Amino acid sequence: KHIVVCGHITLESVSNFLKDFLHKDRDDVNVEIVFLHNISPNLELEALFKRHFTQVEFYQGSVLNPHDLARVKIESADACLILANKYCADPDAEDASNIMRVISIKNYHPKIRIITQMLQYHNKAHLLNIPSWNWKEGDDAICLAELKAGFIAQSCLAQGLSTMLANLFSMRSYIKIEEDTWQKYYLEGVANEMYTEYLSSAFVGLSFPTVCELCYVKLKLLLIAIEYKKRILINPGNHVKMQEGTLGFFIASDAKEVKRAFFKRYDSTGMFHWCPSKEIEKVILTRSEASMTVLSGHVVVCIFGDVTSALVGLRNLVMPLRASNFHYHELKPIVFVGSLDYLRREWETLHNFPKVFILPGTPLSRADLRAVNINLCDMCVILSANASLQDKECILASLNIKSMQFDTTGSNIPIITELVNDSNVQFLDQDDDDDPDTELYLTQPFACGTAFAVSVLDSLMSATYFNDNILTLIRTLVTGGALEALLAEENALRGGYSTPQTLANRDRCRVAQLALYDGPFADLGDGGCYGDLFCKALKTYNMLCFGIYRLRDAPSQCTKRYVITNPPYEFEMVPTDLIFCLMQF
């Protein structure tokens, strides 16, 4: 078996792809990776590669040349992966180019699995027009815009989820730092990767909750979702019972570890909160009108950009924040602080969502910022519209906010800065240890969920090759809902009257972050074991706890909290801890 990787192939992209391919995964001996570029050979740089991995071959040529496709033997190949220029000049033009490859690869041999990256959502739709494109077979398209947005959105609900859900996906091994610092605990979690496995015949008929306990208690495998016979269910309630050989998504250290588990108020779907399309000027707040309202528990997304910028795809940020699993009362209002000229062009996708607001002005003016009462928000998202040196602004905005005093203090505000250049992470937190060479996942600002780069998702490519499900899990988890045709035929979203079959869909779980201090399970804090809590939390409310969001201190000063994924049954808690979890509805 062999695969064909093509599209934007750079030294950096190849090296990154190879790392993620061959780590803890069960078998790597099987697949030969054949890269196909059209750039200058650079035989020397390639020469060494071939020596380290005997599974790697380089050929130049186009994906649009029937001879070259035959030369690389695309027809026989297990799958073909099309890498995109994430940091492209014109995003629309890039997708346009990539779509053509898909068309071509399908033209040569239709029965091929194609994994492809997409920069803009709206373009992802086009892929369905291609005859040979099988959404139901292996063909899948990783939309970078929609996922980047969703990950940041999921952080508004539970701060730090973005980086927790990212480290979980990138294949990485255990490090075991000897000295006592947060690094130790953070990395002990990082060591995770999320694997797919079939449930043992033993579990058949049991309730998911009881199965989940057995897996965690008897095996130390944190189970999060089943694949009912098809639709997938994340943390089902106690009623769900196992159907012969069910497929389960586990979060364990190594791939071999998981083997052991074998012994009109709504959208047409009723998934998202629909609202009558509103005219943009009805939403625009004056600086005063905004300062008048004391907003809190809201999301302040402040975007830089002018009329001639790439569309960030704000649709995908608000959508998961408007899922039906939250009550209208619970919904967080969203305030965009940007240029009106920029906003309006994107606006057309958002008019349907409720509690959306625009305050024209720059994220660098405190006047605009004080007006929207940042001190009070649950999350402040800082985005840079697309030369990457010009993201200097985001750092400035971030630093600005940290140095305010509301009368609370600026440094204690939930911020999440989207960075374009992983190197720039050094700057946003100014007490951390800095080095340009140090990987992003290891930096403090990332560990805490203060920062997030498009870079992080590149790992998904290989990961979604191995398990189709993985990609459909995350997309489902991150965006709220998923179907595509209603969404595809029109980019504008249809809203309908609720049927008892639609009001039924509200039953999906939801991400939340909880405290031990006010907790019903509070008694466990102040020294109790996480293992003892987890089970209690599960059986009593059907809650899944998969992470502690601890302060970076074990004297006390800072508020910054870092992420610990899937801690062991014997893990000492503290009163200050917070719990990442999936609650029922």
- 411 touches Ca ion (CB under 5 A): no
| Least distance to Ca ion, CB of residue 432, Å | 4
Least distance to a second copy, CB of residue 354, Å: 24
> Annotated binding residue at 57?
yes
Give me the least distance between CB of 384 and a second copy, in Å please. 13
Please report how close the Cβ of residue 69 comes to a second copy at its closest, in angstroms: 10
Identify which of residues 193 and 432 has a Cβ nearer to Ca ion in the complex: 432
Residue 107, marked binder: yes
132 near Ca ion, judged by CB under 5 A: no
**In this structure, what token pair is assigned to residue 219?**
């095996």
DSSP 8-state code for residue 219: S
551 burial via Cβ count (<10 Å: 0-12, 13-18, 19+): middle
Q: Which amino acid type is present at position 216?
A: Y
Burial of 59 (0-12, 13-18, 19+ CB in 10 A): middle
On whether 197 is known to bind a ligand per the annotation, the reply is no
Q: Is residue 2 close enough to count as binding a second copy by CB under 8 A? A: no
H-helix or E-strand spanning residue 559: none
Taking residue 484's Cβ as centre, other Cβ atoms within 10 Å add up to: 11
- Determine, following the binding rule CB under 8 A, whether residue 406 of this chain makes contact with a second copy: no
Q: Which span (154-162, 360-368, 420-428, 560-568) binds Ca ion, by CB under 5 A? A: 420-428
CA dist 105 and 66 (Å) reads 9
| Cα dihedral value 264, 271, 520, 545, nearest 10 | -170
> With helix as H, strand as E and coil as C, how does 89-122 read?
CCHHHHHHHHHHHHHHHHHHCCCCEEEEEECCHH
Contacted by 395, from Ca ion, a second copy, none: CB < 5 to 8 Å by type: a second copy
Residue from 68, 139, 422, 432 touching Ca ion (CB under 5 A): that is 432
Three-state secondary structure along 350-379? CCCCCCEEEEECCCCCHHHHHHCCHHHCCE
By CB under 5 A, tell whether 433 contacts Ca ion.
no
**Which of residues 242 and 303 has its CB atom nearest to a second copy in the complex?**
303
Q: Which two tokens stand for residue 255?
A: 């791939």
Q: Which is nearer to Ca ion, 42 or 430 (CB)?
A: 430
Question: Which of 428, 410, 411, 409 lies closest to 419, judged by CA?
Answer: 428
Smallest distance from the beta carbon of 437 to Ca ion, in angstroms? 14
DSSP 305-347: --TTS----THHHHGGGGBTTS-TTTPPPEEEEE-HHHHHHHH
- Closer CB to a second copy, 91 or 528, in the complex: 91
12, 28, 434, 489: which one binds Ca ion (CB under 5 A):
434
Which residue bears the tokens 């239709």? 110
Under rule CB under 8 A, which residues in 105-124 are in contact with a second copy? 106-108, 110
Q: Which is nearer to Ca ion, 10 or 430 (CB)?
A: 430
Beta bridge partners of 384: 304
Residues in 84-123 that interact with Ca ion by CB under 5 A: 107
Taking the least distance from each CB to a second copy, the nearer of 386 and 542 is 386
Q: How many angstroms from the chain centroid is the CA of residue 197? A: 22
Residues that bind a second copy (CB under 8 A): 65-67, 96-97, 99-100, 103-104, 106-108, 110, 126, 128-132, 364-367, 389-390, 392-393, 395-396, 399-400, 402-403, 426-427, 430, 434-436, 489-492
Residues that bind Ca ion (CB under 5 A): 107, 426, 430, 432, 434
Binding residues for Ca(2+): 107
